[PDB]
Symmetry: D2
């Protein structure tokens, strides 16, 4: 088989460790957070990633998945170790490499024999050199002579579809600088990729850049379509028709062209900013990406502007309802969510904000406390509301009872940030 | 069906010819007597593979005829297509004079119901101006004749237009009446993926499509330029991101920029449309800026290589057209490179298998026109590969090195693996 | 919309639950009162990925309710789906029973949509059955009938339903088209890929799609079996042909045959429909012959390897369900293997992550049920890998070698490449 | 690279010409001096003009002597025909192999692009080696398989923009050399036998789809379903795909009929019966009788002396090729029962005359064909037939009956019969 260690319990580490176990590997998944580690082991933590809770539980029961807090205990047990720790934005916008290098030093401190270290974390081009050096310095301090290889294997799964994205990926990208790493990685993924061995091998630097360019291009599709939607509004065109009209060109493709109230999540904002910053360090300005960022920042302001413009600037103190708080459907994650930008402005003007999300309300309460009203379901939310904002397109919002909404609301006004509705109400949307 | 098509650029000529191929009776019209004259004698006014032969058989069969008079075509036609150019106007706006000219001729000549379909790339809302122009001529003549207007944008590439027309990824049609919808359906159904929408949305679709493709290129050019500074391989990065089905693997090639008669003008026109409406298209303006800078990269590589010492050097250029498979040199990256080489007093030898006459019209005696690729490099201290014509793909490196004064190749299209080779990313 | 769905099989349960997840009010009906109680309470095990949790949340939210009386749900429904069983002649009694019940309860216009796989022309009998009940009641009420076959596969049912390649709908009225459009438009955010056709063509499409899938498989099994004899690699062949965009890369995997109720049922249904009309489906008859023979291949390789002397040998089987992700063993290749093993007197140890309770219902004490994949192989002289559950993918071969009496693996799904073992596979 | 290509059918001529267009120095060889004289001075879009520019530019040359081309080439392609006991005729391929062996002066890579049965590469090596042996010379060489996937009449596009390139090799030297050839122009490397099998399996799968759809169409007719709607309904499943699902009056051409048969024969020689393919073949043979039978049934068996018209003779649009054409089965049966047959094809009429002589009347255009016709058969879906003037047809015909073997027409007076 393989013995695999994974460092990190973010989506990436948790999903990857769990899926490798599901595939028959013996896996140890490690993190510094002892509380969460014990809860993952016990099955006492709410998990909203579809299928993940049961997949963890079955692989723990089967004895193929174990959770721990000590990298130094896992290293001598593993044939391959994946660094899948966070790379959040640093104070100046560059990728914060502190957690990645902490893991690398721990690996070097505990190494007992040859091991392959694979960096799955999103790390700037050249990072593999810093990781290698950190590991080697620890071996030197120890005065030991132990062989190892490093590789890059960025992850491309999205929150909300993580297991399917991991188990049936469009491709797997792998940066290597050795035959040994290529062989070991081939043998790891060959049994998984039954349709076609679609592992793309390349040099390490190129694999690291690939992750940045991918997320940057996705963000660019979205900001591009946002600018087009906003223009459509002024000239009397229908952006959903335009989307169909251009996505049908096979050179463009039909996915990730949805305009709306912006992209959120931790990843696109942090990764676009880090790539911009890597470029600046090298004397280069990334003008397309700078524009994509500016557009997205403005787009997160539009829902409030629609609401205030409908009411001709008279919105102080009104009651409103919001459907959707998470940054996208299928998660409790609210990092960089457009909902928070809307909420913050609504609070500045003293609105009474009633919120509902099928999963993210505990996270919302962690962020907002008593500043908003938490409601039991979508219909409870709209009681007495003078506007309804549809911000995150969870499936339960898709087919509302408009009659019931109209009876419950103070004013029959819906502002759709995700362009899902057609009325049988005044409906405002993007484009 | 009896169809008229106005215009004999690739859009009008290819659509007219293909409609005839499919069994329609087609009259294709233009104001240029000389070009029509050549078409009547079996010579095409454009460089389009397979076209002259397709015309020949369809003229012989009696399904295709050419003319210079809209007013004689109109009374015979069930549907007339406006497919004339909409080049950049003086202020970057789409020049609508040719389109409205055609619209007015149609209104002068109309005798009964006709559907007018605009295939020309026209700004959103142009259908309203076109209807008004037609109505005004009907009003002058004091006649009472209904008509419909539709948008059917073109997605053809010069040089591969027949294949693009005959096997399209989709057909986009903007209509505002059932009668127009039924009539266009009956035209396309014996060919075929048909997207019906309102007229404004069809007009916008054409600009948005062209703008997204330009966007892909400028995006990849910024990535390529960064790759160079950080030691990543942009060919591997292209493979790595294009393999995601959300992005796709086509139209991701970095190089020395985009040119032609379509992207620069359509991107400009869309940015201007925005400005007229008090909106700034931020992504597109940045896409435009990146592309303008990218057309300077080849010369800058050359100059940096010779450490700024370039005066009086002989150089050779492979490729002059803005892309392979055409004589078209509008906004070509080659012209930006040549302009700069000339400014610093380089001796410039050029070869293109198709575009040399067009180059000669543009440059006169300023560059040396050579007979073949190997003839171009004789005595050269730099070879620039600017346009990726197929014949340039497998060069004899011995034959080159022993003919050139210096074995330097600066590849603006990332086709070559080995001389010193400079490339993009 | 207020929607009713009759039937609590894969198709009925998944459609009902997904419609409620999308915000509709849904009543889901079946005669089985015990199972209906367990569905409302969230107390029946469900191995369809995601389904148990989605049912529970929609029940709790009040969008999904299970019941036993169709006649209760009809006056409250805008659309009613018939998704009951139609178990090579089709038993239509369940569909027509539902149709009659609808006719007895109808108070106003309703659209009746048949999602069950039914013979071509069934819509005419369904309309006639409903009308008889209206006539008997002396009521004059208009209604429409439609066909909306289901294309989901077991093990991926929710994703298949929520993000389908297409939705096929047979209709004969604008009112029905408009109503069906209003149901699906909100779901299909990427593009509206509802294909409207006449009702008979929608019925035929369901059988023809499944029959084409079966045809690809039997085609590749004949190619794999030839590959063994001429020294070609069928995995390289699959890549070689699947890369032609006119062919495509999906459902080309040769193996120990196709199972499940659906492919055999639907291939046979077309064969029989042809015979009923003086025709013969020659390609499909061959596809079925090839599949029958393919289900003997694993045993034949085992016997040949031991030169026909196999009585009294212990063997182990990994995988019992007809495919991974279900407990469903209907027409499973595992059962054909097990039968032949028992017919020659081999001792059979079995393991499947999910299907062992079903296997015990089917086999009783005929085979030994084991606790995990490694327990299964203890003392075995051959290991058959029949159903490619993921936990089987990366085995500890040394452990297998130590536990087994002989290191022989016979792989009916072409997943393994050896790192001491002998590996036999298909092509 | 210096490349030689042996064979001047569309496979060899297109491959040779496309290699030259891409900058290679190419010598293209055939045994027929007049065809080579013509070329230095087939029906295929764009190929005439591509040959001309590459001959002028001195990258493409035609010759009759393999012997002269071999010591000049880095890579030689065998691209001669393997026409149909039913097994593949290997005589042309082996002739080329022996000539290469007779001429070799140094290491060369021999690439077989001809469609050849699994294991043929062994015979090819043996043939070349025996010649080297006869000469008592010690020269190493490699052999590879590189099957072609070109469709007649869309061949340049198929070559230049292929879905994939398939290469069977048994040496790293061959792999590097072939990689160096294609990279400047998605390449699947495998062992040689798997490459040879891939070609047969691909064509057999395409045939299978057709016969599958023809059985479904014929059934649709009997149960009141519309096979065009069924085609859209099943091809929209991404597992199936929407291309190459068109029922009609059968597949023809040289390729599918002979390759299906050859594969069936390879299997028999190996003690295996390909039951799916044998059924596919049977269905297609019967399908080519469907048009005539629809005509005879329509007229209640009383057909002697009636005049009929046929639109389309070639096995498919875009070619003059009539090998195994459904039109020939239709015409032969029409002549048997004493019908008078008028034909029109925009390209294939000279080929038809070679096969039919004076047995049919050749006409000038689609309208001339239907004059006094009591049935019009649409057999090959050439584009000029797509928007007929149905009034004009009505007036010219003796009876307004159209029998469509390609399901292209919907009527706007006429009776239309079609397949499914
Ligand atoms: O680096 C990462 O970990 C991941 O980041 C993203 O995944 P994620 O941010 O979880 O989710 P997405 O589905 O990309 O959504 C991002 C945001 O874009 C928005 N969005 C998405 C698509 C669209 O067309 N329009 C649009 O506004 C979403 O609603 C959401 O707010 C990428 O999609 C993953 O490939 C990548 O692996
Ligand atoms: O390349 C990959 O990543 C995927 O390849 C296949 O996925 P796919 O070809 O999309 O097929 P599925 O939709 O997962 O399964 C469809 C049918 O094919 C069958 N199948 C799949 C794989 C295989 O090797 N043999 C085989 O018969 C399954 O049993 C099932 O009935 C595998 O089934 C997945 O485990 C894997 O994630
Ligand atoms: O509006 C039009 O009539 C046409 O404009 C373009 O066609 P065209 O400009 O002829 O040619 P492209 O192949 O799109 O090339 C445009 C430019 O981009 C460059 N390019 C193209 C692709 C690429 O990946 N990278 C890149 O630098 C080309 O070399 C060329 O300079 C579009 O591709 C057509 O879909 C459209 O119909
Ligand atoms: O009519 C139905 O209810 C369903 O029947 C099948 O779904 P199902 O039988 O549940 O599952 P499949 O994944 O199609 O598996 C069928 C069998 O084929 C086998 N298989 C599948 C794919 C393959 O390439 N090779 C192969 O042997 C599988 O292992 C399994 O035994 C169809 O795939 C669905 O589209 C259809 O809706
Ligand atoms: O047409 C359909 O059946 C599918 O269309 C979309 O699916 P898809 O375009 O494949 O996108 P997903 O993978 O579901 O989502 C990708 C990203 O796009 C975003 N998205 C999706 C839909 C939308 O309207 N707007 C939008 O921004 C999501 O928030 C997510 O971040 C819907 O999101 C699916 O729920 C639906 O089943
Ligand atoms: O071996 C070869 O050289 C070629 O054989 C065929 O090409 P070809 O026979 O020239 O033409 P096809 O377009 O495949 O048509 C074959 C026959 O099938 C019929 N056909 C095709 C497609 C269809 O859906 N239905 C159908 O009846 C056509 O009318 C024609 O009679 C294959 O398509 C090529 O990929 C292959 O390279």
């Amino acid at each position: 088989s393989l013995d695999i260690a994974v460092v990190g319990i973010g989506y990436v580490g948790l999903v990857s460790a769990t899926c490798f176990a599901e595939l028959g590997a013996n896996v140890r998944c490690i993190d510094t957070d002892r509380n969460k580690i014990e809860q993952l082991n016990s099955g006492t933590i709410p998990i909203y990633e579809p299928g993940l809770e049961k997949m963890i539980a079955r692989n723990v029961k089967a004895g193929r998945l174990r959770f721990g807090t000590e990298i130094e205990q896992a290293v001598p047990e593993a044939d391959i170790i994946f660094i899948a720790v966070g790379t959040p934005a640093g104070e100046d916008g560059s990728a914060d490499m502190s957690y990645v290098l902490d893991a690398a030093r721990s690996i070097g401190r505990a190494m007992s024999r040859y091991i392959l270290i694979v960096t799955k974390s999103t790390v700037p081009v050249g990072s593999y050199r810093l990781i290698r050096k950190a590991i080697q310095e620890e071996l030197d301090k120890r005065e030991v002579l132990i062989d190892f290889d490093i590789a890059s294997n960025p992850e491309f799964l999205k929150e909300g579809n993580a297991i399917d994205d991991f188990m049936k990926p469009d491709r797997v990208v792998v940066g290597v600088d050795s035959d040994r790493a290529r062989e070991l990685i081939t043998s790891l993924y060959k049994p998984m990729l039954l349709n076609n061995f679609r592992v793309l091998f390349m040099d390490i630097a190129s694999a690291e850049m690939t992750k940045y360019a991918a997320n940057a291009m996705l963000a660019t599709r979205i900001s591009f379509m946002n600018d087009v939607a906003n223009l459509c509004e002024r000239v009397g065109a229908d952006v959903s028709m335009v989307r169909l009209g251009i996505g049908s060109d096979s050179r463009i493709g039909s996915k990730f062209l949805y305009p709306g109230c912006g992209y959120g999540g931790s990843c696109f904002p942090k990764d676009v900013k880090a790539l911009i910053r890597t470029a600046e360090d090298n004397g280069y300005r990334m003008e397309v990406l700078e524009a994509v960022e500016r557009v997205n920042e403005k787009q997160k302001s539009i829902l409030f502007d629609k609401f205030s413009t409908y009411y001709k600037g008279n919105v102080q103190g009104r009651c409103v309802a919001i459907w959707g708080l998470s940054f996208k459907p299928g998660t409790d994650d609210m990092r960089e969510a457009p909902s928070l930008v809307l909420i913050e402005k609504l609070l500045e003007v003293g609105c009474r904000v009633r919120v509902y999300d099928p999963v993210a309300m505990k996270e919302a309460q962690k962020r907002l406390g008593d500043k908003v009203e938490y409601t039991t379901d979508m219909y409870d939310a709209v009681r007495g509301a003078e506007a309804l904002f549809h911000v995150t397109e969870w499936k339960e919002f898709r087919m509302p009872d408009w009659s019931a909404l109209s009876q419950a609301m103070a004013a029959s006004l819906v502002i759709d940030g995700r362009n899902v509705y057609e009325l049988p109400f005044t409906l405002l949307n993007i484009g």
